[PDB]
Amino acid sequence: MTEYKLVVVGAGGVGKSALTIQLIQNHFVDEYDPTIEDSYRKQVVIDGETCLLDILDTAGREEYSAMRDQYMRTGEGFLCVFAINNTKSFEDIHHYREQIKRVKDSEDVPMVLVGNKCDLPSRTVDTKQAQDLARSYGIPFIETSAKTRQGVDDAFYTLVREIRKHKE
Amino acid sequence: SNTIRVFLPNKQRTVVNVRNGMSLHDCLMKALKVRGLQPECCAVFRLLHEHKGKKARLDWNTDAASLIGEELQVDFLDHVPLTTHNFARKTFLKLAFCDICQKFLLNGFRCQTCGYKFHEHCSTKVPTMCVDWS
Ligand SMILES: Nc1nc2c(ncn2[C@@H]2O[C@H](COP(=O)(O)OP(=O)(O)NP(=O)(O)O)[C@@H](O)[C@H]2O)c(=O)[nH]1
Ligand SMILES: [Mg+2]
Ligand SMILES: [Zn+2]
Ligand SMILES: [Zn+2]
Ligand SMILES: [Zn+2]
């Protein structure tokens, strides 16, 4: 059974944990609980193959910018998350994307751009802007809501397919 | 800084902030439940980096601040009927229903231990831990 080491990165409060827990436990927490370090394992079927997802939820607080480099190295695929509500967190995806590429010494890095908090009505980031940023990186883009579970499966399923394709 | 790193069952881990007064149980209940682990099916250990033994058991209500800067491990109690699922391709000739979404299930997957039957697009909704009293 193939294991897949996934890492969820992004600004604090964009929904990395809400997304992951919606994946692992089918529940939705609407509370504030800034993460420091959280690792999850769960089995998932993808294109017929049962595989093992090992997900690391990272801290978006910049108070933890030092443990970042080490976990980015071991990780095989990355979910770069931003909230459609926060423009800063959208522009900061670049900061995270360059930080990952330094430790992986390549640009064929398995990555998926994720737009969370799609339920809310105050959408400051347009689909087209995000598709443009994804085409700019040559990676997929996927809109999600941890509240309603929209595209939560799709986001992780697509990261795994990126790993398999890059694995060749 | 006032944190504890806790290794968890099935090779998972967490770092928790220790608010003053909390027990290890109060610090760890969510991280265990959010992984589908019942805290009642678990013990918390202090890892001993200098011993014949790898770890010594602690009381769950032990005050957590008493262990800031140690490395803790949570393990399943002896022989608890929890395990990891064992999935298999299965095709259902007879009408079957998905245990997750109750729609018809034609071409899916089943655990070979507990029997959960599901659609691929429902697999993330299968509970993390396989329960077995067989
Ligand atoms: N309405 C709505 N709220 C969401 C959504 N996703 C996350 N939230 C809310 O956003 C807040 C923080 O989410 P959280 O998952 O903790 O984000 P994070 O990116 O893991 N934060 P941190 O980096 O500090 O650990 C919580 O109030 C949570 O309920 C979503 O899709 N919709
Ligand atoms: Mg978090
Ligand atoms: Zn910046
Ligand atoms: Zn099972
Ligand atoms: Zn189903």
Author numbering:
A (entry chain A): 1 to 168
B (entry chain B): 55 to 188
How does the study describe this entry?
The interaction of membrane-bound active RAS with RAF is the first step in the activation of this pathway. Active RAS recruits RAF to the membrane where RAF dimerizes and becomes active. The N-terminal CR1 region contains the RAS-binding domain (RBD) and the cysteine-rich domain (CRD), the CR2 region contains a 14-3-3 recognition site, whereas the C-terminal CR3 region includes the kinase domain and a second binding site for 14-3-3 proteins. Here, we present crystal structures of wild-type and oncogenic mutants of KRAS in complex with the RBD and CRD of RAF1.
To understand if oncogenic mutations at G12, G13, and Q61 positions in KRAS have any effect on KRAS-RBDCRD interaction interfaces, and to identify any druggable pockets at the KRAS-RBDCRD interface, we attempted to crystallize and solve the structures of G12C/D/V, G13D, and Q61L/R mutants of KRAS in complex with RAF1(RBDCRD). We were able to obtain well-diffracting crystals of G12V, G13D, and Q61R mutants of KRAS complexed with RAF1(RBDCRD) and solved their structures in the resolution range between 2.11–2.87 Å. Since the mutant structures belong to the same crystal form as the WT KRAS-RBDCRD structure obtained in crystal form II, we used this structure to examine any structural changes in KRAS and at KRAS-RBDCRD interfaces. Structural superposition of WT KRAS-RBDCRD with all three mutant structures shows similar interaction interfaces, suggesting that the two RAS-binding domains of RAF1 bind to oncogenic KRAS mutants similarly to WT KRAS. A closer examination of the switch regions of KRAS shows minor conformational changes in the structures of oncogenic mutants complexed with RBDCRD when compared with WT KRAS-RBDCRD structure. The presence of a larger side chain at G12, G13, or Q61 position results in local rearrangement of side chains of some of the neighboring residues present in the switch regions without perturbing interactions at KRAS-RBDCRD interfaces. The side chain of R61 in the KRAS Q61R-RBDCRD structure points towards the KRAS-RBD interface and occupies an empty space surrounded by KRAS residues Y64, P34, and I36, therefore not impacting the KRAS-RBD interface. These results suggest that RAF1 does not differentiate between WT and oncogenic mutants of active KRAS.
